[PDB]
Design a protein around this motif. Structure first.
Motif, PDB file in Angstrom:
ATOM      1  N   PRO A 120      -6.334   5.836  29.710  1.00 53.05           N
ATOM      2  CA  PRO A 120      -5.258   5.384  30.599  1.00 53.05           C
ATOM      3  C   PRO A 120      -4.015   6.264  30.502  1.00 53.05           C
ATOM      4  O   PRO A 120      -3.724   6.810  29.437  1.00 53.05           O
ATOM      5  CB  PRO A 120      -4.943   3.980  30.066  1.00 53.05           C
ATOM      6  CG  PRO A 120      -5.384   4.031  28.636  1.00 53.05           C
ATOM      7  CD  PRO A 120      -6.653   4.814  28.699  1.00 53.05           C
ATOM      8  N   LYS A 121      -3.295   6.387  31.612  1.00 48.64           N
ATOM      9  CA  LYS A 121      -2.064   7.169  31.672  1.00 48.64           C
ATOM     10  C   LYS A 121      -1.069   6.516  32.627  1.00 48.64           C
ATOM     11  O   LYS A 121      -1.431   6.110  33.731  1.00 48.64           O
ATOM     12  CB  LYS A 121      -2.361   8.598  32.133  1.00 48.64           C
ATOM     13  CG  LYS A 121      -2.730   9.571  31.022  1.00 48.64           C
ATOM     14  CD  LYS A 121      -3.579  10.714  31.565  1.00 48.64           C
ATOM     15  CE  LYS A 121      -3.100  12.071  31.066  1.00 48.64           C
ATOM     16  NZ  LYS A 121      -3.143  12.208  29.585  1.00 48.64           N
ATOM     17  N   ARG A 122       0.186   6.418  32.198  1.00 45.73           N
ATOM     18  CA  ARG A 122       1.237   5.831  33.022  1.00 45.73           C
ATOM     19  C   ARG A 122       1.710   6.835  34.069  1.00 45.73           C
ATOM     20  O   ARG A 122       1.809   8.032  33.790  1.00 45.73           O
ATOM     21  CB  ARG A 122       2.425   5.425  32.151  1.00 45.73           C
ATOM     22  CG  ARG A 122       2.865   3.985  32.317  1.00 45.73           C
ATOM     23  CD  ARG A 122       2.305   3.148  31.186  1.00 45.73           C
ATOM     24  NE  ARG A 122       2.603   3.761  29.896  1.00 45.73           N
ATOM     25  CZ  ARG A 122       3.699   3.512  29.188  1.00 45.73           C
ATOM     26  NH1 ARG A 122       4.601   2.650  29.641  1.00 45.73           N
ATOM     27  NH2 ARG A 122       3.893   4.118  28.025  1.00 45.73           N
ATOM     28  N   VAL A 123       2.009   6.348  35.271  1.00 43.97           N
ATOM     29  CA  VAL A 123       2.497   7.209  36.344  1.00 43.97           C
ATOM     30  C   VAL A 123       3.620   6.543  37.135  1.00 43.97           C
ATOM     31  O   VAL A 123       3.726   5.319  37.169  1.00 43.97           O
ATOM     32  CB  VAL A 123       1.369   7.595  37.319  1.00 43.97           C
ATOM     33  CG1 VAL A 123       0.303   8.415  36.608  1.00 43.97           C
ATOM     34  CG2 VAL A 123       0.761   6.353  37.946  1.00 43.97           C
ATOM     35  N   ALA A 124       4.454   7.361  37.769  1.00 36.75           N
ATOM     36  CA  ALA A 124       5.542   6.862  38.603  1.00 36.75           C
ATOM     37  C   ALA A 124       5.200   7.055  40.077  1.00 36.75           C
ATOM     38  O   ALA A 124       4.973   8.177  40.526  1.00 36.75           O
ATOM     39  CB  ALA A 124       6.837   7.569  38.260  1.00 36.75           C
ATOM     40  N   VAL A 125       5.163   5.960  40.828  1.00 31.54           N
ATOM     41  CA  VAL A 125       4.780   6.019  42.235  1.00 31.54           C
ATOM     42  C   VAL A 125       5.964   6.349  43.135  1.00 31.54           C
ATOM     43  O   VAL A 125       7.027   5.737  43.035  1.00 31.54           O
ATOM     44  CB  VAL A 125       4.135   4.701  42.707  1.00 31.54           C
ATOM     45  CG1 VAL A 125       3.869   4.749  44.204  1.00 31.54           C
ATOM     46  CG2 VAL A 125       2.851   4.437  41.940  1.00 31.54           C
ATOM     47  N   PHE A 126       5.770   7.322  44.017  1.00 28.69           N
ATOM     48  CA  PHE A 126       6.816   7.735  44.943  1.00 28.69           C
ATOM     49  C   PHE A 126       6.738   6.933  46.234  1.00 28.69           C
ATOM     50  O   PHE A 126       7.696   6.270  46.624  1.00 28.69           O
ATOM     51  CB  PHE A 126       6.693   9.230  45.238  1.00 28.69           C
ATOM     52  CG  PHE A 126       7.449   9.675  46.457  1.00 28.69           C
ATOM     53  CD1 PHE A 126       6.777  10.019  47.616  1.00 28.69           C
ATOM     54  CD2 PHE A 126       8.828   9.751  46.442  1.00 28.69           C
ATOM     55  CE1 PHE A 126       7.469  10.429  48.738  1.00 28.69           C
ATOM     56  CE2 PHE A 126       9.525  10.162  47.561  1.00 28.69           C
ATOM     57  CZ  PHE A 126       8.844  10.499  48.709  1.00 28.69           C
ATOM     58  N   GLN A 127       5.582   6.999  46.883  1.00 27.23           N
ATOM     59  CA  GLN A 127       5.350   6.305  48.141  1.00 27.23           C
ATOM     60  C   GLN A 127       3.867   6.408  48.468  1.00 27.23           C
ATOM     61  O   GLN A 127       3.128   7.106  47.779  1.00 27.23           O
ATOM     62  CB  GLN A 127       6.191   6.930  49.255  1.00 27.23           C
ATOM     63  CG  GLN A 127       5.921   6.369  50.635  1.00 27.23           C
ATOM     64  CD  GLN A 127       6.714   5.118  50.934  1.00 27.23           C
ATOM     65  OE1 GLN A 127       7.774   4.889  50.354  1.00 27.23           O
ATOM     66  NE2 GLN A 127       6.213   4.305  51.857  1.00 27.23           N
ATOM     67  N   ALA A 128       3.427   5.714  49.511  1.00 27.18           N
ATOM     68  CA  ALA A 128       2.014   5.720  49.868  1.00 27.18           C
ATOM     69  C   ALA A 128       1.784   5.412  51.343  1.00 27.18           C
ATOM     70  O   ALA A 128       2.584   4.724  51.974  1.00 27.18           O
ATOM     71  CB  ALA A 128       1.253   4.740  48.997  1.00 27.18           C
ATOM     72  N   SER A 129       0.681   5.924  51.880  1.00 24.78           N
ATOM     73  CA  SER A 129       0.319   5.694  53.273  1.00 24.78           C
ATOM     74  C   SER A 129      -1.068   6.244  53.597  1.00 24.78           C
ATOM     75  O   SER A 129      -1.453   7.306  53.111  1.00 24.78           O
ATOM     76  CB  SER A 129       1.362   6.314  54.204  1.00 24.78           C
ATOM     77  OG  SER A 129       1.067   6.031  55.562  1.00 24.78           O
ATOM     78  N   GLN A 130      -1.811   5.506  54.418  1.00 21.11           N
ATOM     79  CA  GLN A 130      -3.139   5.922  54.868  1.00 21.11           C
ATOM     80  C   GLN A 130      -4.167   6.098  53.754  1.00 21.11           C
ATOM     81  O   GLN A 130      -5.037   6.964  53.839  1.00 21.11           O
ATOM     82  CB  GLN A 130      -3.054   7.206  55.693  1.00 21.11           C
ATOM     83  CG  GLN A 130      -2.810   6.981  57.167  1.00 21.11           C
ATOM     84  CD  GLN A 130      -2.883   8.265  57.959  1.00 21.11           C
ATOM     85  OE1 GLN A 130      -2.352   9.293  57.542  1.00 21.11           O
ATOM     86  NE2 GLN A 130      -3.545   8.215  59.109  1.00 21.11           N
TER      87      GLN A 130
END
Lengths: 52, 50
Positions: free
Chosen positions: A42-52
């Motif tokens: 497992p690895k932590r990540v920072a989400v910017f944005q999402a689409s499609q």
């Protein structure tokens, strides 16, 4: 007449992964990385944005 | 239950042990803003229909 307008817009370059690959528990977002050995880490990540 | 579940698996004769969680549920909260909705003449009930 009615007309449907579809727009496509490109964002700034960001790391890209599928959406089913991202787990979000509200206080944390993570993905499951596959290791050289096949080990699932497992690895932590920072989400910017999402689409499609 | 989490601690007990893991000590249970250390036991010689146990094959599996899993304690059901009481709050492992996932939510998408729509936190309606009365002041924001009122701007469009909408009540909480109005928004919730969507």
């Amino acid at each position: 007449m009615n007309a449907w307008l579809q727009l496509n817009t490109a964002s700034e370059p960001m790391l890209l992964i599928p959406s089913q690959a991202l787990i979000d528990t509200g206080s944390e977002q993570r993905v499951i990385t596959v290791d050289a050995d096949g080990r699932f880490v497992p690895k932590r990540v920072a989400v910017f944005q999402a689409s499609q | 239950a989490e601690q007990i579940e893991e000590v249970a698996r250390t036991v010689p004769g146990v094959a599996s042990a899993l304690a059901e969680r009481l709050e492992g549920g996932r939510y998408i909260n729509v936190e309606i803003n009365r002041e924001k909705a009122a701007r469009y003449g909408m009540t909480v009930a109005d928004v919730q229909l969507f």
